Amino acid sequence: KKILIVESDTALSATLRSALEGRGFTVDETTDGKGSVEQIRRDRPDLVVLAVDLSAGQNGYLICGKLKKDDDLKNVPIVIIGNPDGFAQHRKLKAHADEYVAKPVDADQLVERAGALIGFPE
């Protein structure tokens, strides 16, 4: 089970990657929001952990929007990590994510949600 973390906070990304790896997921990381949709197309992760507050002012909800509108990528499960002050708005939309986890992230909660969406590695 393969996860891509799209997060420019490298310290957070490394922490979350380690928790997920300890549970048995294979995990990759990218700091590059501009590039992430095409990376997901080439690599096809089983799940994406997607930060809202990406580099250079990028809105990670917009990446989710591109993914939920792409016929080949719209079923990749998406866990948003971000300020919960944005979740109520985003949950209404056609391009809502599959799970929303507040920053500051509880790594164990994130691991649980990943397993809930794609199953735990066995």
Residue numbers in the entry: 3 to 124
Could you give the paper's own sentences about this structure?
The Myxococcus xanthus FrzS protein transits from pole-to-pole within the cell, accumulating at the pole that defines the direction of movement in social (S) motility. The N-terminal receiver domain (RD), a 258-residue coiled-coil domain, and the extreme C-terminal tail of the protein are all required for the dynamic subcellular localization and S-motility activity of FrzS. Here we show using atomic-resolution crystallography and NMR that the FrzS receiver domain (RD) displays the conserved switch Tyr102 in an unusual conformation, lacks the conserved Asp phosphorylation site, and fails to bind Mg2+ or the phosphoryl analogue, Mg2+·BeF3. The crystal structures of the mutants suggested that the observed conformation of Tyr102 in the wild-type FrzS RD is not sufficient for function.
In the FrzS RD, the conserved Tyr102 adopted an ‘inward-facing’ rotamer. Remarkably, this conformation was distinct from those in either the inactive or active CheY. Furthermore, the conformation of Tyr102 is stabilized by hydrogen bonding of the hydroxyl group to His92 Nδ1, clearly visible in difference electron density in the high-resolution structure. In contrast to the CheY structure, we observed no conformational heterogeneity along the α4-β5-α5 face of the 1.0 Å FrzS RD structure, even at low contours of electron density below 0.25 σ. The position of Tyr102 in FrzS is partially buried, suggesting that apo-FrzS does not prevent interactions along the α4-β5-α5 face by steric clashes with the switch tyrosine.
